[PDB]
Amino acid sequence: SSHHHHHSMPDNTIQWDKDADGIVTLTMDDPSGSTNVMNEAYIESMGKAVDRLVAEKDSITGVVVASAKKTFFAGGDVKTMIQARPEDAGDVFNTVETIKRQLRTLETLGKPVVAAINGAALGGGLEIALACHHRIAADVKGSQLGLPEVTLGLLPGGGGVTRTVRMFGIQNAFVSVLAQGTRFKPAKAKEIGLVDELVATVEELVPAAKAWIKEELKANPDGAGVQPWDKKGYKMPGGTPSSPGLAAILPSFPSNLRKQLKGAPMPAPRAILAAAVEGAQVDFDTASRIESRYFASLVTGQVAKNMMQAFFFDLQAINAGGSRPEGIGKTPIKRIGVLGAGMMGAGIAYVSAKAGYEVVLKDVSLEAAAKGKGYSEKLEAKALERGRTTQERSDALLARITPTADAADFKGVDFVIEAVFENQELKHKVFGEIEDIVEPNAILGSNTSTLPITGLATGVKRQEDFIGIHFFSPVDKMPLVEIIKGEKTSDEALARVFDYTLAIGKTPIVVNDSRGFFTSRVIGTFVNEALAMLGEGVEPASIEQAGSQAGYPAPPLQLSDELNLELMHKIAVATRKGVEDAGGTYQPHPAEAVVEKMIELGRSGRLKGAGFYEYADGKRSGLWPGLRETFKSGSSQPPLQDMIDRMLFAEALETQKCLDEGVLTSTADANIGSIMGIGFPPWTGGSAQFIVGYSGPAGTGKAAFVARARELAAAYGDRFLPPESLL
Amino acid sequence: MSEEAFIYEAIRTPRGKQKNGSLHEVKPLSLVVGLIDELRKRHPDLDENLISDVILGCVSPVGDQGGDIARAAVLASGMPVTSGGVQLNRFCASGLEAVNTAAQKVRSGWDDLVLAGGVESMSRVPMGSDGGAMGLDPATNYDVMFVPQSIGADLIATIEGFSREDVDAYALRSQQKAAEAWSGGYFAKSVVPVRDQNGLLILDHDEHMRPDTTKEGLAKLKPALGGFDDVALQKYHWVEKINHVHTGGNSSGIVDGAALVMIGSAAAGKLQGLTPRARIVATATSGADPVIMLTGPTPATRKVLDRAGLTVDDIDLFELNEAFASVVLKFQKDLNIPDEKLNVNGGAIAMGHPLGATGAMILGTMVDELERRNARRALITLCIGGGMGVATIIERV
Amino acid sequence: SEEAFIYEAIRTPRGKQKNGSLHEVKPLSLVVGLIDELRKRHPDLDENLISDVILGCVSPVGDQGGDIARAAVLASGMPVTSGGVQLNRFCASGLEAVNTAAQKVRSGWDDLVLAGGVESMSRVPMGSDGGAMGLDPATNYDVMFVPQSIGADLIATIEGFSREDVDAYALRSQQKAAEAWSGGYFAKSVVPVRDQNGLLILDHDEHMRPDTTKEGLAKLKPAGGFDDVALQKYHWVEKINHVHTGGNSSGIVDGAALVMIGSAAAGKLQGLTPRARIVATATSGADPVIMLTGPTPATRKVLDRAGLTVDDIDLFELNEAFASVVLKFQKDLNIPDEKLNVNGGAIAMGHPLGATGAMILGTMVDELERRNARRALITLCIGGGMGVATIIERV
Ligand SMILES: O=[N+]([O-])c1ccc(S(=O)(=O)O)cc1
Ligand SMILES: O=[N+]([O-])c1ccc(S(=O)(=O)O)cc1
Ligand SMILES: O=[N+]([O-])c1ccc(S(=O)(=O)O)cc1
Ligand SMILES: O=[N+]([O-])c1ccc(S(=O)(=O)O)cc1
C-alpha cells in the first residue's frame, strides 16, 4: 500500500517544479553519480514525489518525468542485487512490489504523464518511461532504449514484462524486446512502438512534453492519462492465451525456446516467458505481482550472480584499464599492415577498416590478396541489403583496404599484424622481410595460436615492439583479443595493443607467455574430453548433445573439424618431443588415439573435406555413419550430466592451473577470456566463476566443486583432481 | 475380487469423417442418445431404474461436449433421474477406462448395472479446444519436455527401425481388413446408423475408409515450426536425426463417433433377462517415457496378463488402437504377436479415432469377433499421451 | 474382498473470489503443492506403487483442461505409470473421485490411488466449459433446465423455511467454522499455499466472515424466465419465496484437496497408518428442476447398503450448497442439530466444486479422530438432480 520501503536515511534524487499551468516536472538527478540508477535513494525519492502528486492532485494538471544527466536512467544497483540470498526473497519481492506501486500510481493519476527521454533509458529506466502515457526521445548520438536484464540473468521486474505484453502482445514483446534484452536506437525505438515522438535536441524535450499535455487535455479529455489497457474495451494485440488464434501456437513457445537455448540451463528466458504468459491471463495488478515473484526467483539464484559478476563487475574492470599498464600514454595509429589474407588476415583487415584505419593487405600473390579483400566485400554487400550501412559508407570502408603482394607497399605502417602459417621459421622469415621497411616505432604483432612469443621475437631487431595479438575466427564476430606478453615485451607495447583492441570494438585480456597461452590451452582440454569419450565408446550424438546442453556455442566434435585434426596431431608431436628429449616421460592423453585414427582414415576435418561430420557442397551434412562402427559406440552409456560435467570441469580445472602458473593475472580476465574467446557458456560467468559459483545436487560453492571433481576422478581419471589451490 | 462383471451390449455409431463429414451436423449429445434409444429397442421391458450410472469418456469436454455430457444423455434420453452420469478424460483410453471403471464399480458390489462408453465429435470440437493445464503454463511445459504424439511415433519408428514402406504396409493392411470386415457383415449388428429427428438416414458406414488404397498411393503422401524435434532429441540424446515416416494415411483419422457398452453383474442380467456376451477378466494401467508418449501399452499388457494368469499364447485376438503404425509395429515386435491375431478387422487408420469413444468401440469390436470366430479370449489396449496405457482382457460367454 | 482405507486426507485453504489470494495461482499449482506435502509426510514412499491419480473438476477448460490429473503427475515428477484421470459429476466430483478410487481398490486391480479435486473458480468461472444445456435449445427446452439457486428457493418455499430460518443456519455455520479454526481443528490438514520462492500466499479460508450477525444477514439482497419454468413443473405452488443470498449460499472460492486411498496390504507394504475405513458408497437422485434433492435417497441407500440407520452415525457432513438444502436434509432424516456439519461448511469457507467432496471427506476424517468417534456420513447435492454419499469408519 505504501510508496516507501520502511513502513540515517537515504539522500534525495528528484527535483520538484510546478509551473503556473499545473504541470509538475520531476527531474531525476542522483547526486551520488553521473547516472540515474535504481537504488534506495531513488525508491525513497520517487516515493515522496508520488505521495506529493496525490496530496496536491487538485492543483496538478500533468506530470513530466525528466533527467538532468547525460543519460535518462540506466539500470539498478548490482552491488546490492548480487548479494540477495534465498532467505532474502521476501525483501526482494517487497522491493519490486514497492517500485511498481509507485509507477502504478503515477500511471493511474487521472492526468497525462510524459517521459522526457534525453539519453539512454535502459532497464529500470525504460520501465519508468513505460509507466508514462507518452514518450518523447531526443534523437542524439549514444542514446539507447531497451530492457537488457536478461543479459544479467534477471528480468524486467519493474513492470517491463507486464507492460510490453500489454503494448505488443505475448509474442512480439517476448521476441523483440524481452527475451534477448535488445537495445534500440531512438529511430528504431519509435518504429517498434517503445517511443512515440522524436525531437532534434534535448532542449526541446521538456517544452514539447508540456505542449503534448496541453493538446491531450484539450483534444482527448476523457482518455487523458489512461493507458490502453486501463480502458473498458481493451484487446491485447495478438490475443490473450484464451483466444483461439494464440492457443494454437502458444504450446509451441516453450519448445521453440528450448530449441534456441539448445537445452542449456539458463533460467531467465524461461521465467520471462512464464511471467509474460501468466500475466496475460489476469488483470494488470495480478500480472504485476506474478512478475515480482519470478524476479525474486532469479535474483536469489546462482546463475544471475554468475552473469552479474562476469558481464557487469568483471567487464567493467577490464574496460577500465584493469590489465593495461598505468603510467603509459597514448600513441595513435596511422596505417595498418596485415601479413596474410586467409579467413584470419582478411578478417583482421575488415575490423581494422570498419573502425576507420587504413590497411595494407599483403599476401604471396595479388590474386590471393584480392580474394582477401573479397572477404570484406561480401560482408559489406550483405550489410547493404539488410540495411545497417549506407552506400557512401561501404565504399569508404573497402577503399581503405589496399590489397598487394609487394613487400615494399608496407612503407608507412606503424602497426603490423601477421597472420600466416603457424611455423616459427616462416614468421622469422616474414618479420625479417618487413621490420626494416615499416616505421621504427611500429608494433609487430603475431596472431599466434600456440607458439611462444619469446621464441618468435628472436627474429626481429627491436624485441620491445614484438607482441602476440591473438584474434579469433571469424574476426568480424569474435570480440576477444588475447594479448600475450613475451619476456622482452615492453609495458609500452601492451598499452598500444590494448588501445587498438578498444579502437576496433573488442575486449582485451593480458596473458603471460607460455605454450597454449590461455584460450588454446583451455579449449584443448574441452575437445580432448569429447574425443576421449568417443574412444571410450560413447555415442557421438550424445557427445554433441552434451556439449550443446552444457551451454557451448558449438558442440565439441563439430568444433574439432573446424580446428582440423592435422593441427591437433602436430601439437601432440611437439608436446611429446618437448618432454622426451628433455629427460622425462610422456603420458599421452587418451584422445590422441582417436586423433590419429581419424587421420589414418583420411578424415582430418573440414579443411580436408571430411571429419567427424560429412560436408557436401560447403555446408555441413550429418555425422559420418562409419563413426559408430569405428569406435564401437554404444558400449559406453554414461549419464549425460557426467558427459556435460567432464567438459565443464576439464576447462574449469585447466583455468585454475593458468591462474596458478601466473599465465592469467586476474579472475576477471579468466572469465571474460573464457566466455568471449573460446565460448565458455555465459550462464557460468566464466571458467573461474564456475568454481566459486558452482551448483549441483551435491551442494554449492568451491566446496561443492571439489566434491564433484573428486566424484569424476574416481570414475574417469586423475585429470579431474583439484589442485592444492582449491583445497 | 467379489462380483464378476459381464458385457451385455456393446454398440457404436459409424465414424463420420472430418472434412465434409456426414456427422458434422449432428450434436455429440445426439450420438449418445441414439445409442441409448437402440438399447431400449433391443430391450423394451428393461427396468432402467436398475441402471445406476452412465460413464462417458470425452477428451474435449468443451462446448457441445461440456457440462457433463453423460448427465445430459441421461436427461435428454428421458432415463431415470437416479441414473447419475459422469464424464471422465484419460486422453486416448477414455473409452476403455470408462468401461473398466464400470466393471470395477460392479466388482466392488456397490453398483449393479452401468452404462459405459464415450463420445467425440472432432469435426465440431477439435482436439485441444479444452486448452490445457500445461499448454497455458510455459513454466511446466518447459520442464516436462513435452513432445506431441506424432513426433513420438516418428521417433519410435526411427529407433526400432521401421521404414516408410514398413508403416505404409501396415496402413494398407488395416484398410484391407476393415473393408473385408464390412463386406462380410461383421459389423452389421453393432454399427447403429445415425438418423435425424425425422427418421431419415445420415450415416450408416465408417466413411473415413479408403478401401482402394494402394502401396503407390501411400508413397505419394507427405509427412505431417515448433522445435519439438530439438526437444525430443535433447532427452534421447543418442539419436542423431528423427525419421518422419508418418503421414495422414498411416495414422489414425479425425472422425466423429460414439460408443456404448452395458456392463453389470450376473444377478443384474438374470433379473432383467439379459444374455451375457462376454466377461471382463482383468484390467491394468502403466506406461513409459512421457516424451516418446506412445510406449504405454507394453507394460499395461503385461500387467493385465500377469493379473489374469495368462500368457500371449492364451490370447486369441489382440486389439491395439491404430493411433500410429509404428506403435502397433513396436507392440507387435516386442510381444511377438502373430499377424493373424492383431486388429483382424482393421483399425483407426481405416475407420477413425474418435478419442473419447475409441476405447469402447474397439472393445465392442472384439466382443463380436470372438462370437463370430467362436473364440475364447481377447485383449484390448490403447496408447495415451504422457506415456499412459490401459489394457483389458475379455472372455466370451 | 479387499477393503479400502484412507491414509492421508489434506486440502488447501479456500481463497475467495473477489481479490482472492489464490487468484494468481494456477489450479495445477494447487494440486502439485498437495502432492509435495504427501511426499514430505512419507519421503520413503515408493511412488511406483501409486497406480492412478483421480481428480474431480467441474470446469475442465483452460488452466483446468487437458486432463489436469495427468499434468499433476508429470509436473510433480511422479512416475509416468501413476495414471491421471479427470472426471466431472458436478458438485460431487471430489467425493466421486474418492469413491471411484476406493472401488478400484476393492476390485483388486489397483493398489494405491490418489484422489481429490481442484477448482480455481476465480480463474475458471463455472460455465466456462459450455454445456449441452445452453448450446442446444432443443434439449434445454425439454428437460426444463432451472438453476440450482432457484431450486433451493423452491425447496424453502415448499418446506416453509423462512428467510430468518436460512440466515440462522448461515450464522450457525460461520460460528462453527470460526470455532474449528481457533480450536486448531484444521491445523494438520489445511496445507498453506506458497510460491516458487517459499513466500506465503494463503494459510486460511478467507471467505469466512466470523463476525457475522443475524442483523447483517437480513440486510442482504437475494440472488430469465426460470421462475416460471420451475412453477410449470411444480404447479401446486403459486409463488417462489426467494430467501437465499450470498450470505446463506455457498462461497465461490479456489481450492484443491487430495486423499491417499489403498489396500491394507499396500498400507503395510509402505509403512502407512490407516486413519479411516471406507464402509460403503452409493449414488441416486431426484427431480432435475428442483435439482438439489438427491442426497436424501443417496443417503438412505448407503445406510441400507451398510446395514446402518441414522442412530448408528456419529457425524453427518452435507455440503452447504444452500441453507434450505441442509435444513430439508435435516428435517427428513431427523438429524440431531449437534451432529450436522459440526465444523462449519461451504457457506463460511467455500464450495470449490471439483474439490469440495474431497475437502469435507477429510474434514470428517479429522473430526472422528479428534472426538475419538466411530462413524461419519458424507454427502453432496448435485446439479441435474444427482447425489452421492459415503460412510467412513475410524481405525
Ligand atoms: O536496486 N535494488 O534492487 C535495490 C533493492 C533494495 C534496496 S534497499 O532495500 O537497500 O533500499 C536498494 C536497491
Ligand atoms: O530488489 N532487489 O533487487 C533487492 C536486492 C537485494 C535486496 S537485500 O539484499 O537488501 O535484501 C533487496 C532487494
Ligand atoms: O548499461 N548497461 O550495460 C546496463 C546493463 C544492464 C542493465 S539492467 O539489467 O540493470 O537493466 C542496465 C544497464
Ligand atoms: O586444440 N587442441 O587439441 C589443443 C591441444 C593442446 C594444446 S596445448 O598443448 O597448447 O595446451 C592446444 C590445443
PDB file of N, CA and C in Angstrom, chain B residues 1-2 27 53 63 66-68 71 81-82 87-91 97 104-105 107-108 110-111 130 132-133 136 281 283 288 307 386 388, chain C residues 1 26 52 62 65-67 70 80-81 86-90 96 100 103-104 106-107 109 129 131 135 279 281 283 285-286 305 384 386:
ATOM      1  N   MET B   1     -11.927 -58.617  -5.436  1.00  0.00           N
ATOM      2  CA  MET B   1     -12.483 -59.638  -6.316  1.00  0.00           C
ATOM      3  C   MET B   1     -14.004 -59.529  -6.373  1.00  0.00           C
ATOM      4  N   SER B   2     -14.673 -60.263  -5.487  1.00  0.00           N
ATOM      5  CA  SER B   2     -16.119 -60.146  -5.254  1.00  0.00           C
ATOM      6  C   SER B   2     -16.860 -60.448  -6.557  1.00  0.00           C
ATOM      7  N   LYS B  27     -25.113 -33.084 -33.282  1.00  0.00           N
ATOM      8  CA  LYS B  27     -24.547 -32.755 -31.986  1.00  0.00           C
ATOM      9  C   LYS B  27     -24.101 -34.034 -31.281  1.00  0.00           C
ATOM     10  N   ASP B  53     -25.501 -45.763 -13.163  1.00  0.00           N
ATOM     11  CA  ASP B  53     -24.566 -44.751 -13.633  1.00  0.00           C
ATOM     12  C   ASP B  53     -24.396 -44.856 -15.142  1.00  0.00           C
ATOM     13  N   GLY B  63     -17.849 -26.947 -25.007  1.00  0.00           N
ATOM     14  CA  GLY B  63     -18.885 -26.574 -25.949  1.00  0.00           C
ATOM     15  C   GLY B  63     -20.022 -27.572 -25.996  1.00  0.00           C
ATOM     16  N   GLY B  66     -19.354 -30.142 -23.201  1.00  0.00           N
ATOM     17  CA  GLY B  66     -19.131 -29.731 -21.832  1.00  0.00           C
ATOM     18  C   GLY B  66     -20.344 -29.962 -20.949  1.00  0.00           C
ATOM     19  N   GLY B  67     -20.175 -29.637 -19.672  1.00  0.00           N
ATOM     20  CA  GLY B  67     -21.287 -29.715 -18.738  1.00  0.00           C
ATOM     21  C   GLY B  67     -21.735 -31.127 -18.433  1.00  0.00           C
ATOM     22  N   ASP B  68     -20.785 -32.052 -18.272  1.00  0.00           N
ATOM     23  CA  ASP B  68     -21.090 -33.457 -18.011  1.00  0.00           C
ATOM     24  C   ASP B  68     -22.013 -34.020 -19.088  1.00  0.00           C
ATOM     25  N   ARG B  71     -24.413 -36.718 -18.135  1.00  0.00           N
ATOM     26  CA  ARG B  71     -25.634 -36.341 -17.431  1.00  0.00           C
ATOM     27  C   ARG B  71     -26.689 -35.825 -18.399  1.00  0.00           C
ATOM     28  N   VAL B  81     -33.934 -40.246 -13.510  1.00  0.00           N
ATOM     29  CA  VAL B  81     -33.097 -39.183 -12.983  1.00  0.00           C
ATOM     30  C   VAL B  81     -32.124 -39.681 -11.921  1.00  0.00           C
ATOM     31  N   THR B  82     -32.293 -40.913 -11.446  1.00  0.00           N
ATOM     32  CA  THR B  82     -31.390 -41.517 -10.476  1.00  0.00           C
ATOM     33  C   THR B  82     -30.232 -42.264 -11.126  1.00  0.00           C
ATOM     34  N   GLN B  87     -18.715 -37.726 -16.744  1.00  0.00           N
ATOM     35  CA  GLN B  87     -17.712 -37.681 -17.796  1.00  0.00           C
ATOM     36  C   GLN B  87     -16.328 -37.844 -17.183  1.00  0.00           C
ATOM     37  N   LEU B  88     -15.447 -38.547 -17.892  1.00  0.00           N
ATOM     38  CA  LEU B  88     -14.053 -38.648 -17.484  1.00  0.00           C
ATOM     39  C   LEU B  88     -13.164 -38.485 -18.707  1.00  0.00           C
ATOM     40  N   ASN B  89     -11.897 -38.166 -18.452  1.00  0.00           N
ATOM     41  CA  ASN B  89     -10.928 -37.888 -19.510  1.00  0.00           C
ATOM     42  C   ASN B  89      -9.582 -38.469 -19.106  1.00  0.00           C
ATOM     43  N   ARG B  90      -9.218 -39.596 -19.703  1.00  0.00           N
ATOM     44  CA  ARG B  90      -7.865 -40.128 -19.630  1.00  0.00           C
ATOM     45  C   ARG B  90      -7.239 -40.135 -21.017  1.00  0.00           C
ATOM     46  N   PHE B  91      -7.400 -39.028 -21.746  1.00  0.00           N
ATOM     47  CA  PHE B  91      -6.982 -38.903 -23.141  1.00  0.00           C
ATOM     48  C   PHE B  91      -7.470 -40.084 -23.976  1.00  0.00           C
ATOM     49  N   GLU B  97     -11.244 -46.789 -20.341  1.00  0.00           N
ATOM     50  CA  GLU B  97     -11.228 -46.506 -18.909  1.00  0.00           C
ATOM     51  C   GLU B  97     -12.643 -46.409 -18.355  1.00  0.00           C
ATOM     52  N   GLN B 104     -15.200 -52.217 -12.688  1.00  0.00           N
ATOM     53  CA  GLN B 104     -14.701 -52.131 -11.320  1.00  0.00           C
ATOM     54  C   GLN B 104     -15.787 -51.675 -10.355  1.00  0.00           C
ATOM     55  N   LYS B 105     -16.739 -50.867 -10.827  1.00  0.00           N
ATOM     56  CA  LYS B 105     -17.866 -50.491  -9.981  1.00  0.00           C
ATOM     57  C   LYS B 105     -18.751 -51.694  -9.678  1.00  0.00           C
ATOM     58  N   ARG B 107     -17.642 -54.833  -9.694  1.00  0.00           N
ATOM     59  CA  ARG B 107     -16.844 -55.743  -8.880  1.00  0.00           C
ATOM     60  C   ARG B 107     -16.845 -55.326  -7.415  1.00  0.00           C
ATOM     61  N   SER B 108     -16.872 -54.018  -7.146  1.00  0.00           N
ATOM     62  CA  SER B 108     -16.921 -53.550  -5.765  1.00  0.00           C
ATOM     63  C   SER B 108     -18.216 -53.948  -5.070  1.00  0.00           C
ATOM     64  N   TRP B 110     -21.072 -52.308  -5.132  1.00  0.00           N
ATOM     65  CA  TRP B 110     -21.890 -51.153  -4.796  1.00  0.00           C
ATOM     66  C   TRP B 110     -22.590 -50.560  -6.013  1.00  0.00           C
ATOM     67  N   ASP B 111     -22.503 -51.227  -7.162  1.00  0.00           N
ATOM     68  CA  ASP B 111     -23.225 -50.850  -8.368  1.00  0.00           C
ATOM     69  C   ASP B 111     -23.668 -52.121  -9.078  1.00  0.00           C
ATOM     70  N   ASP B 130     -10.139 -27.738 -25.370  1.00  0.00           N
ATOM     71  CA  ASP B 130     -10.199 -27.612 -23.922  1.00  0.00           C
ATOM     72  C   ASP B 130      -9.022 -26.847 -23.345  1.00  0.00           C
ATOM     73  N   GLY B 132      -5.413 -26.485 -22.004  1.00  0.00           N
ATOM     74  CA  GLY B 132      -4.554 -27.465 -21.371  1.00  0.00           C
ATOM     75  C   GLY B 132      -3.834 -26.923 -20.157  1.00  0.00           C
ATOM     76  N   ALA B 133      -3.851 -27.685 -19.058  1.00  0.00           N
ATOM     77  CA  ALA B 133      -3.169 -27.249 -17.844  1.00  0.00           C
ATOM     78  C   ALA B 133      -1.688 -26.994 -18.094  1.00  0.00           C
ATOM     79  N   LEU B 136      -1.015 -23.741 -21.355  1.00  0.00           N
ATOM     80  CA  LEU B 136      -1.003 -22.350 -20.921  1.00  0.00           C
ATOM     81  C   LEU B 136      -0.030 -22.099 -19.775  1.00  0.00           C
ATOM     82  N   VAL B 281     -12.215 -60.005 -17.670  1.00  0.00           N
ATOM     83  CA  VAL B 281     -11.292 -60.848 -16.912  1.00  0.00           C
ATOM     84  C   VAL B 281     -10.352 -60.015 -16.051  1.00  0.00           C
ATOM     85  N   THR B 283      -8.136 -55.830 -15.865  1.00  0.00           N
ATOM     86  CA  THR B 283      -7.723 -54.544 -16.412  1.00  0.00           C
ATOM     87  C   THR B 283      -6.405 -54.147 -15.760  1.00  0.00           C
ATOM     88  N   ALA B 288       5.265 -45.734 -20.086  1.00  0.00           N
ATOM     89  CA  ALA B 288       6.700 -45.497 -20.162  1.00  0.00           C
ATOM     90  C   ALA B 288       6.988 -44.012 -20.346  1.00  0.00           C
ATOM     91  N   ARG B 307      -2.025 -60.376 -14.184  1.00  0.00           N
ATOM     92  CA  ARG B 307      -3.138 -60.373 -13.241  1.00  0.00           C
ATOM     93  C   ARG B 307      -4.121 -61.498 -13.538  1.00  0.00           C
ATOM     94  N   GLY B 386       1.309 -38.571 -22.524  1.00  0.00           N
ATOM     95  CA  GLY B 386       2.142 -38.657 -21.342  1.00  0.00           C
ATOM     96  C   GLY B 386       2.800 -39.999 -21.116  1.00  0.00           C
ATOM     97  N   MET B 388       0.808 -43.113 -21.073  1.00  0.00           N
ATOM     98  CA  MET B 388      -0.164 -43.868 -20.300  1.00  0.00           C
ATOM     99  C   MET B 388      -0.658 -45.056 -21.112  1.00  0.00           C
TER     100      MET B 388
ATOM    101  N   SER C   1     -14.023 -57.945  -1.655  1.00  0.00           N
ATOM    102  CA  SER C   1     -12.996 -58.657  -0.906  1.00  0.00           C
ATOM    103  C   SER C   1     -12.074 -57.675  -0.190  1.00  0.00           C
ATOM    104  N   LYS C  26      -2.099 -20.934 -10.438  1.00  0.00           N
ATOM    105  CA  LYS C  26      -2.705 -21.860 -11.382  1.00  0.00           C
ATOM    106  C   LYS C  26      -3.327 -23.027 -10.618  1.00  0.00           C
ATOM    107  N   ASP C  52      -2.798 -44.690  -9.955  1.00  0.00           N
ATOM    108  CA  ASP C  52      -3.687 -43.729 -10.596  1.00  0.00           C
ATOM    109  C   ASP C  52      -3.840 -42.500  -9.712  1.00  0.00           C
ATOM    110  N   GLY C  62      -9.273 -24.466 -20.184  1.00  0.00           N
ATOM    111  CA  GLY C  62      -8.206 -23.507 -19.941  1.00  0.00           C
ATOM    112  C   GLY C  62      -7.144 -24.083 -19.027  1.00  0.00           C
ATOM    113  N   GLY C  65      -8.066 -27.746 -18.226  1.00  0.00           N
ATOM    114  CA  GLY C  65      -8.276 -28.705 -19.287  1.00  0.00           C
ATOM    115  C   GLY C  65      -7.077 -29.611 -19.487  1.00  0.00           C
ATOM    116  N   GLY C  66      -7.172 -30.444 -20.519  1.00  0.00           N
ATOM    117  CA  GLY C  66      -6.077 -31.339 -20.858  1.00  0.00           C
ATOM    118  C   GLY C  66      -5.754 -32.364 -19.793  1.00  0.00           C
ATOM    119  N   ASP C  67      -6.773 -32.876 -19.103  1.00  0.00           N
ATOM    120  CA  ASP C  67      -6.607 -33.897 -18.070  1.00  0.00           C
ATOM    121  C   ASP C  67      -5.624 -33.420 -16.997  1.00  0.00           C
ATOM    122  N   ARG C  70      -3.381 -35.742 -15.042  1.00  0.00           N
ATOM    123  CA  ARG C  70      -2.135 -36.193 -15.653  1.00  0.00           C
ATOM    124  C   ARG C  70      -1.052 -35.128 -15.548  1.00  0.00           C
ATOM    125  N   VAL C  80       5.596 -41.938 -14.432  1.00  0.00           N
ATOM    126  CA  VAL C  80       4.665 -41.871 -15.547  1.00  0.00           C
ATOM    127  C   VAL C  80       3.640 -42.994 -15.523  1.00  0.00           C
ATOM    128  N   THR C  81       3.870 -44.032 -14.720  1.00  0.00           N
ATOM    129  CA  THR C  81       2.916 -45.118 -14.552  1.00  0.00           C
ATOM    130  C   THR C  81       1.784 -44.769 -13.593  1.00  0.00           C
ATOM    131  N   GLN C  86      -9.176 -37.095 -15.117  1.00  0.00           N
ATOM    132  CA  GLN C  86     -10.089 -36.062 -14.649  1.00  0.00           C
ATOM    133  C   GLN C  86     -11.525 -36.502 -14.897  1.00  0.00           C
ATOM    134  N   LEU C  87     -12.382 -36.318 -13.895  1.00  0.00           N
ATOM    135  CA  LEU C  87     -13.799 -36.625 -14.030  1.00  0.00           C
ATOM    136  C   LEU C  87     -14.634 -35.442 -13.557  1.00  0.00           C
ATOM    137  N   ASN C  88     -15.931 -35.508 -13.851  1.00  0.00           N
ATOM    138  CA  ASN C  88     -16.842 -34.401 -13.572  1.00  0.00           C
ATOM    139  C   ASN C  88     -18.233 -34.966 -13.327  1.00  0.00           C
ATOM    140  N   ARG C  89     -18.666 -34.959 -12.070  1.00  0.00           N
ATOM    141  CA  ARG C  89     -20.054 -35.210 -11.708  1.00  0.00           C
ATOM    142  C   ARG C  89     -20.623 -33.993 -10.988  1.00  0.00           C
ATOM    143  N   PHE C  90     -20.328 -32.807 -11.522  1.00  0.00           N
ATOM    144  CA  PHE C  90     -20.730 -31.517 -10.943  1.00  0.00           C
ATOM    145  C   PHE C  90     -20.244 -31.484  -9.493  1.00  0.00           C
ATOM    146  N   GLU C  96     -16.865 -38.284  -5.685  1.00  0.00           N
ATOM    147  CA  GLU C  96     -16.898 -39.371  -6.658  1.00  0.00           C
ATOM    148  C   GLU C  96     -15.496 -39.887  -6.950  1.00  0.00           C
ATOM    149  N   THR C 100     -14.642 -43.674  -6.389  1.00  0.00           N
ATOM    150  CA  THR C 100     -14.129 -44.459  -7.508  1.00  0.00           C
ATOM    151  C   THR C 100     -12.768 -45.058  -7.178  1.00  0.00           C
ATOM    152  N   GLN C 103     -13.392 -47.934  -4.960  1.00  0.00           N
ATOM    153  CA  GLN C 103     -13.940 -49.060  -5.706  1.00  0.00           C
ATOM    154  C   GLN C 103     -12.861 -49.753  -6.529  1.00  0.00           C
ATOM    155  N   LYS C 104     -11.898 -48.988  -7.051  1.00  0.00           N
ATOM    156  CA  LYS C 104     -10.798 -49.601  -7.788  1.00  0.00           C
ATOM    157  C   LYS C 104      -9.875 -50.383  -6.862  1.00  0.00           C
ATOM    158  N   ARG C 106     -11.049 -52.025  -4.134  1.00  0.00           N
ATOM    159  CA  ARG C 106     -11.795 -53.225  -3.765  1.00  0.00           C
ATOM    160  C   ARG C 106     -11.741 -54.280  -4.864  1.00  0.00           C
ATOM    161  N   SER C 107     -11.782 -53.855  -6.130  1.00  0.00           N
ATOM    162  CA  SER C 107     -11.768 -54.808  -7.234  1.00  0.00           C
ATOM    163  C   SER C 107     -10.473 -55.605  -7.293  1.00  0.00           C
ATOM    164  N   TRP C 109      -7.629 -54.614  -8.744  1.00  0.00           N
ATOM    165  CA  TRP C 109      -6.808 -54.218  -9.879  1.00  0.00           C
ATOM    166  C   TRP C 109      -6.194 -52.835  -9.690  1.00  0.00           C
ATOM    167  N   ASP C 129     -16.953 -24.202 -19.407  1.00  0.00           N
ATOM    168  CA  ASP C 129     -16.883 -25.386 -20.252  1.00  0.00           C
ATOM    169  C   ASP C 129     -17.969 -25.418 -21.316  1.00  0.00           C
ATOM    170  N   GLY C 131     -21.566 -26.489 -22.308  1.00  0.00           N
ATOM    171  CA  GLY C 131     -22.592 -27.412 -21.855  1.00  0.00           C
ATOM    172  C   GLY C 131     -23.618 -27.728 -22.925  1.00  0.00           C
ATOM    173  N   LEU C 135     -26.053 -24.502 -25.441  1.00  0.00           N
ATOM    174  CA  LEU C 135     -25.818 -24.504 -26.878  1.00  0.00           C
ATOM    175  C   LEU C 135     -26.824 -25.357 -27.637  1.00  0.00           C
ATOM    176  N   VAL C 279     -16.596 -47.504   4.394  1.00  0.00           N
ATOM    177  CA  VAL C 279     -17.538 -48.598   4.610  1.00  0.00           C
ATOM    178  C   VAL C 279     -18.362 -48.867   3.357  1.00  0.00           C
ATOM    179  N   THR C 281     -20.365 -46.795  -0.382  1.00  0.00           N
ATOM    180  CA  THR C 281     -20.708 -45.653  -1.215  1.00  0.00           C
ATOM    181  C   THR C 281     -22.035 -45.934  -1.908  1.00  0.00           C
ATOM    182  N   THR C 283     -24.979 -43.930  -4.990  1.00  0.00           N
ATOM    183  CA  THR C 283     -25.439 -42.811  -5.802  1.00  0.00           C
ATOM    184  C   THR C 283     -26.932 -42.945  -6.064  1.00  0.00           C
ATOM    185  N   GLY C 285     -30.660 -39.946  -6.887  1.00  0.00           N
ATOM    186  CA  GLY C 285     -31.042 -38.586  -7.206  1.00  0.00           C
ATOM    187  C   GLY C 285     -32.540 -38.382  -7.161  1.00  0.00           C
ATOM    188  N   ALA C 286     -32.948 -37.185  -7.565  1.00  0.00           N
ATOM    189  CA  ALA C 286     -34.358 -36.807  -7.575  1.00  0.00           C
ATOM    190  C   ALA C 286     -34.581 -35.796  -8.700  1.00  0.00           C
ATOM    191  N   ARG C 305     -27.221 -50.052   2.535  1.00  0.00           N
ATOM    192  CA  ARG C 305     -26.175 -50.915   1.995  1.00  0.00           C
ATOM    193  C   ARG C 305     -25.196 -51.360   3.073  1.00  0.00           C
ATOM    194  N   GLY C 384     -28.528 -31.084 -12.008  1.00  0.00           N
ATOM    195  CA  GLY C 384     -29.134 -32.145 -12.775  1.00  0.00           C
ATOM    196  C   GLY C 384     -29.995 -33.088 -11.962  1.00  0.00           C
ATOM    197  N   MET C 386     -28.659 -35.228  -9.026  1.00  0.00           N
ATOM    198  CA  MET C 386     -27.909 -36.398  -8.602  1.00  0.00           C
ATOM    199  C   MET C 386     -27.554 -36.287  -7.120  1.00  0.00           C
TER     200      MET C 386
END
